[PDB]
C-alpha cells in the first residue's frame, strides 16, 4: 500500500539492524503484483528444465546431494522473460547503494549473478553451513523468497540461522515477498531444514572489494 522509500528503509532500518544483529528481514519488499511476476518467471525457468544441482565450493563429498538438495540456475538479469528478476536485482543493488558503506567496514563494489534455487520437497534441504568460510569475498547474503501461504508446520523449509554471540537461533520462514540480509561469514552458520513442498528463493551475494580482489589470484608457477 504505502511502502517505505528505499533510502529510508536502508538508513533507518537495514543498516542499524544489520549492525546490531547481523540479520535483517524486510517483509513486503516489492508488493504482490511484482512478487507474483517474479514467481511466474521463476516457474517458467523451472518448467523448462533449466535448473542444475547445487554445487559446493570444494567438491569433497561423495555426492553434492548429501549436502544441498536444491536445483538452481544463474540469472544475469537481462535474459528474455527474466525482466522482473532483473528488477528485483536492481532494487537490491539500490538498497546496498543507499547503505553507503555503512554495513560494518565493508566496501561493496560488486556481487554475483542471481542464484534461483528450488528445493523440490521430498525432504530436501541444505545442511548447516557458512556461505563464505575462507575469504572468497562474500560479505553480505541477500535472499528473496517467493512462497505464498507457506506453512512450515506442514512443509518444513525453515531457514535456521545460528548467529555467533546470540543465545537463541533465528528461524526465518520463506515467505512470499520477504527479503533477507545476513553476514556471509562465520558469524552466521545456517541451514535449510528439510522442505516437503516446492520451495523457491532467489539469492545474491555482495562482495567486499578488498577480500574479493585477494580471492582472484592466478599462480603462473605450479602452485
Amino acid at each position: 500500500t504505502k511502502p517505505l522509500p528505499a533510502l529510508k528503509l536502508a538508513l533507518e532500518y537495514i543498516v542499524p539492524c544489520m549492525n546490531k544483529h547481523g540479520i535483517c528481514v524486510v517483509d513486503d519488499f516489492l508488493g504482490k503484483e511484482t512478487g507474483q511476476q517474479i514467481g511466474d518467471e521463476v516457474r517458467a525457468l523451472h518448467d523448462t528444465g533449466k535448473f542444475t544441482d547445487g554445487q559446493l565450493v570444494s567438491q569433497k563429498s561423495d555426492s553434492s546431494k548429501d549436502i544441498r538438495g536444491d536445483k538452481i540456475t544463474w540469472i544475469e538479469g537481462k535474459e528474455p522473460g527474466c525482466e522482473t528478476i532483473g528488477l528485483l536485482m536492481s532494487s537490491m543493488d539500490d538498497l546496498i547503494r543507499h547503505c553507503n558503506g555503512k554495513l560494518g567496514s565493508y566496501k561493496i563494489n560488486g556481487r554475483t549473478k542471481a542464484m534461483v534455487a528450488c528445493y523440490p520437497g521430498n525432504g530436501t534441504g541444505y545442511v548447516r553451513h557458512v556461505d563464505n568460510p575462507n575469504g572468497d569475498g562474500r560479505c553480505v547474503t541477500c535472499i528473496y523468497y517467493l512462497n505464498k501461504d507457506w506453512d512450515a508446520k506442514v512443509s518444513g523449509g525453515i531457514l535456521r540461522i545460528f548467529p555467533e554471540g546470540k543465545a537463541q537461533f533465528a528461524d526465518i520462514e520463506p515467505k512470499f515477498d520477504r527479503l533477507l540480509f545476513f553476514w556471509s561469514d562465520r558469524r552466521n552458520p545456517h541451514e535449510v531444514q528439510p522442505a516437503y513442498a516446492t520451495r523457491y528463493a532467489i539469492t545474491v551475494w555482495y562482495f567486499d572489494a578488498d577480500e574479493r580482489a585477494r580471492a582472484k589470484v592466478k599462480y603462473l608457477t605450479g602452485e
Binding site: 554445487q55 559446493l56 565450493v57 549436502i67 543493488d93 546496498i96 560488486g110 554475483t112 549473478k113 542464484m115
Partner: peptide
Amino acid sequence: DLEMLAPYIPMDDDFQL
C-alpha cells in the same frame, strides 16, 4: 571442512555496481 559445505559461486565475471 567448512569449505566442503559452502555454496559454489563463479570466480569470474562478477557484476559491478
